[PDB]
Design a protein around this ligand. Sequence first.
Ligand SMILES: Nc1nc2c(ncn2[C@@H]2O[C@H](COP(=O)(O)OP(=O)(O)NP(=O)(O)O)[C@@H](O)[C@H]2O)c(=O)[nH]1
Ligand SMILES: [Ca+2]
Ligand SMILES: [Ca+2]
Ligand SMILES: [Ca+2]
Ligand SMILES: [Mg+2]
Ligand SMILES: [Mg+2]
Length: 166
Amino acid sequence: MTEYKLVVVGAVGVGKSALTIQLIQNHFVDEYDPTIEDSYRKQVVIDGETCLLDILDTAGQEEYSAMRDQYMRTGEGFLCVFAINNTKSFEDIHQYREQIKRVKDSDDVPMVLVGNKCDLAARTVESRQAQDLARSYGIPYIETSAKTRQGVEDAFYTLVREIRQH
Ligand SMILES: Nc1nc2c(ncn2[C@@H]2O[C@H](COP(=O)(O)OP(=O)(O)NP(=O)(O)O)[C@@H](O)[C@H]2O)c(=O)[nH]1
Ligand SMILES: [Ca+2]
Ligand SMILES: [Ca+2]
Ligand SMILES: [Ca+2]
Ligand SMILES: [Mg+2]
Ligand SMILES: [Mg+2]
């Protein structure tokens, strides 16, 4: 069957792991355990196609930035996550995209911009601000909550649909 290699990137604490775990295991992780690098694999049906999602959950701790080149090499599409209550994480997106761009030597790498924690009211990144960033990259912007599940399937499935346009 078709395999899609997805990679989830973004700053510390934005909810990369909680998003992936909500998608794959259908529950919310409330606690914080920093990730080094974990892999998840699950068979799903997307738009009638039975396929395998292979998802790499990466570290947001800058201390592990040296690992980024390797995972940017293998991935077919990237979920670039920030949190809507974390302006610095939004500003950090470009460093993730710029490296993805250099490593892929491409300006059309499949990606989706994700604004996570949309269940929280302490918003400092307005939807339109993120829409503008995504537009400049030529990719969709989607808001999610790993806590409530809002947008979670949408974000990952949209990334699959982006890879399919490549
Ligand atoms: N309210 C709310 N909290 C969230 C959401 N997503 C993650 N969190 C919380 O934010 C914290 C960090 O989440 P986590 O998924 O570990 O972040 P991460 O981006 O994987 N961190 P790291 O880069 O260190 O691996 C956890 O306490 C988690 O419960 C969300 O959508 N809503
Ligand atoms: Ca829980
Ligand atoms: Ca390279
Ligand atoms: Ca692009
Ligand atoms: Mg994590
Ligand atoms: Mg502002």
